[PDB]
Amino acid sequence: QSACTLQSETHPPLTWQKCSSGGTCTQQTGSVVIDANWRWTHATNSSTNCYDGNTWSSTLCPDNETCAKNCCLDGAAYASTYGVTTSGNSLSIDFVTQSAQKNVGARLYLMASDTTYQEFTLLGNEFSFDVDVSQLPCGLNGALYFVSMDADGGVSKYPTNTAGAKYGTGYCDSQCPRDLKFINGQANVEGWEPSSNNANTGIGGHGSCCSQMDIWEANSISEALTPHPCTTVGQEICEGDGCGGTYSDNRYGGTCDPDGCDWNPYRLGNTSFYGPGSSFTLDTTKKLTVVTQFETSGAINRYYVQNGVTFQQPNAELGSYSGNELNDDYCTAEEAEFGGSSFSDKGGLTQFKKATSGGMVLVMSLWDDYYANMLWLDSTYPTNETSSTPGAVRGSCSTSSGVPAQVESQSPNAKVTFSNIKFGPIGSTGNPSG
Numbered sequence: 001q002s003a004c005t006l007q008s009e010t011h012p013p014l015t016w017q018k019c020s021s022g023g024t025c026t027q028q029t030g031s032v033v034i035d036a037n038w039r040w041t042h043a044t045n046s047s048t049n050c051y052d053g054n055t056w057s058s059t060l061c062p063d064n065e066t067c068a069k070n071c072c073l074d075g076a077a078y079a080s081t082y083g084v085t086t087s088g089n090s091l092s093i094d095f096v097t098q099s100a101q102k103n104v105g106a107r108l109y110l111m112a113s114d115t116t117y118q119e120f121t122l123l124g125n126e127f128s129f130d131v132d133v134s135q136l137p138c139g140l141n142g143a144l145y146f147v148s149m150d151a152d153g154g155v156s157k158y159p160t161n162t163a164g165a166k167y168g169t170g171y172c173d174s175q176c177p178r179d180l181k182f183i184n185g186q187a188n189v190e191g192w193e194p195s196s197n198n199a200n201t202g203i204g205g206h207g208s209c210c211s212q213m214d215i216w217e218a219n220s221i222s223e224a225l226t227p228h229p230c231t232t233v234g235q236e237i238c239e240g241d242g243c244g245g246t247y248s249d250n251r252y253g254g255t256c257d258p259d260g261c262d263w264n265p266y267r268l269g270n271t272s273f274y275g276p277g278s279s280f281t282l283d284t285t286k287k288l289t290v291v292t293q294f295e296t297s298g299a300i301n302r303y304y305v306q307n308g309v310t311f312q313q314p315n316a317e318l319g320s321y322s323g324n325e326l327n328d329d330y331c332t333a334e335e336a337e338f339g340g341s342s343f344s345d346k347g348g349l350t351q352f353k354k355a356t357s358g359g360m361v362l363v364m365s366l367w368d369d370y371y372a373n374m375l376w377l378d379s380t381y382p383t384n385e386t387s388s389t390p391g392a393v394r395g396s397c398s399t400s401s402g403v404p405a406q407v408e409s410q411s412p413n414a415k416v417t418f419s420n421i422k423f424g425p426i427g428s429t430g431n432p433s434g
């Protein structure tokens with residue numbers, strides 16, 4: 001797709017810290033850009049929509065190639081249309097914003113410049129950030145993660161994509177998302193199936209896969225840390241159901257692991273660690289600091305800080321595994337106790353190390369789940385399972401919670417705030433910022 005300028009594209013600024021082993025942290029200046037799927041897509045020579053509701057213009061978009069040549073992406077009014085605002089080192093995203101249209105959530109990327117994505121090499125480093133999840137009830141997910149996206153949004157590989165990173169193109173993740181309107185410089189109109197439960201989305205014949213590091217997926221009830229390997233580290237297109245993931249009939253038929261080696265404290269047995277109120281170790285009605293460390297062995301460590309007190313990831317006992325570190329032993333034990341083979345089939349942490357050794361793009365979003373109502377995160381799932389089944393209970397939300405239409409009308413004012421992002425070698429982000 002190309003880019004049009006009926007609406008100016010001004011990326012909201014966002015500062016973060018880059019720290020060194022020497023003990024100092026220096027301020028960096030970046031900005032955020034909203035994903036292409038959220039933008040107005042119209043004809044290059046007029047205001048005629050190429051996509052409206054959940055269907056494509058059959059004349060402007062008779063196929064993927066022609067559609068890409070005839071259509072462009074436009075600018076976004078971040079605050080008034082998407083409810084996305086920043087202030088210094090802080091970023092806030094509102095759940096539902098009502099303007100000339102109704103908007104739900106947003107997916108944003110951190111930029112190095114006005115035309116490129118900031119890449120982060122996680123291996124050997126740690127990532128810290130503060131978060132306020134107090135306004136996120138059951139069914140919502142304020143996410144912060146990394147994906148192996150190209151820094152230019154794909155422009156160099158796909159010449160027909162001239163909008164690039166400036167317009168948020170090139171997304172990919174371990175679900176090999178088929179809901180993307182533009183993949184590899186082409187539209188996704190061929191094989192498009194509108195959603196039976198969502199008036200603004202659909203499923204195309206193509207998906208976009210790549211490694212994904214889910215550092216933070218949570219609401220005020222539950223939180224999870226999950227690495228997802230793919231046999232092909234970087235962004236790569238897939239065909240229909242061969243994609244696997246959430247948008248396909250066969251979830252495990254693709255090249256990526258849609259489940260991952262997840263770590264949710266509640267699911268592991270500690271139901272008193274994270275929750276709303278002073279009865280939990282970490283009170284989700286108050287802001288907290290989350291630190292994630294990627295050691296060279298390929299294992300992942302985690303600690304939290306709230307009101308000056310530090311808490312390491314709680315100890316978990318799963319099979320012959322005991323500890324608080326996400327490593328090969330934990331992931332093997334989880335597959336044994338909870339079931340599954342997706343993570344190990346895709347190479348596990350060894351294959352995942354290939355992704356963290358390379359560049360990854362930072363993504364921040366707020367979303368509701370039209371496929372599983374976020375039950376996999378904060379409730380009992382599958383809903384037919386009981387508490388006797390190992391790993392079924394992931395949170396205290398009712399199995400009837402998370403219906404999109406319901407949460408959108410009952411909690412329109414929900415929101416999430418990410419702030420004070422710090423990155424640098426292991427053991428350095430706790431030092432004085434600059």
Ligand SMILES: OC[C@H]1O[C@@H](O[C@H]2[C@H](O)[C@@H](O)[C@H](O)O[C@@H]2CO)[C@H](O)[C@@H](O)[C@@H]1O
Pocket residue numbers: 226246258259260262372376377381
């Ligand atoms: O596809 C939705 C959601 O799935 C998450 O994986 C679940 C999986 O769906 C479930 O069958 C299994 O029992 O548990 C895993 C871990 O919670 C996946 O981690 C999410 O990224 C994804 O959005």
Ligand SMILES: *[C@@H]1O[C@H](CO)[C@@H](O)[C@H](O)[C@H]1NC(C)=O
Pocket residue numbers: 269270271272273281311312313314315
């Ligand atoms: C949960 O984790 C916290 C912090 O590690 C710990 O203090 C508490 O005792 C744990 N509770 C249970 C029931 O395991």
